[PDB]
Design a binder for these strands. Structure first.
Lengths: 82, 82, 79, 73
DNA sequence: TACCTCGTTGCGTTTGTTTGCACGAAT
DNA sequence: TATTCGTGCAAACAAACGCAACGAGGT
């Protein structure tokens, strides 16, 4: 048996993956590549990765048809003259 | 992607894709996912999406923007029916 | 019509634009102290937003405008 | 040209069309104070709108719509 | 002269917004 | 003559940093 993916579990899955990628590369090495101090990469793990992770998880659900039709109408309105 | 690519270029592509996905997701759900006041969400994107995107590029985290093709297609359909 | 929601949309747009440019940077651009931009946000911008709603002076949402630009690029250059 | 002046003219004209009573009601100012309020605040907010490029994005979108129309036609 | 290293944490600095005050204009 | 406003200034707050000390696991 299994349960379907849900957003909070996906956020946890993504946070784990992100933190592991930083650890495998190395915090100082990641800092050097990003262009901030290692103290920033270190602190971001606490201050931003949780937020970044929930945003990425929500984005995994994409756009449902109803919502896409609404966006298309809105954007088409902007791209229609007069 | 094995060569010497400048991560800033992939970072810029990631930023474009994330900004597009967030625009489709909407201000309410975005600001909610990242715990930012909706009245300063443009400011947050200004301040944090570039950093977040550079981080993802460095961690080689893929970011695809497939719903944009879908949106363009549906917008075009609306415009052509005039 | 429903001016209430439009007033709220306009207020959010104004506050978002000021924050994007920056409270201090907006002040410098306008010619007043940064403390005035901070105070205008709290005192008169909400009320001014309802006036703009009644006048039908709202503007395109910046996010949707972004999507419109992206879509136009696709329609123009995608083959 | 001078954007704030352009904005102020259009703004004051639309406000004049709206009238004293409805303008005072919209901003929550007593009718006896609305003329002074406008005299002082519209110039300030017109400047603010110019700075925030109010209306500029809409003007850009109109241009885009015309370009896209030419492609799709 | 607490093994070396490199991620975490203490702090002072840089950059950005709001609050405490008192002044001077308009009435 | 005095009250309400709207301001500029500077300090209080706030957001994020970089540098460098700290200290257990990897060397």
């Amino acid at each position: 048996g299994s349960h379907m993916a849900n957003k909070r579990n996906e956020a946890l899955r993504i946070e784990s993956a992100l933190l592991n990628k930083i650890a495998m590369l190395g915090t100082e090495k990641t800092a050097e590549a990003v262009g901030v101090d290692k103290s920033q990469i270190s602190r971001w793990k606490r201050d931003w990765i949780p937020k970044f992770s929930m945003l990425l998880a929500v984005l995994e659900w994409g756009v449902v048809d109803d919502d896409m039709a609404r966006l298309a109408r809105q954007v088409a309105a902007i791209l229609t003259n007069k």
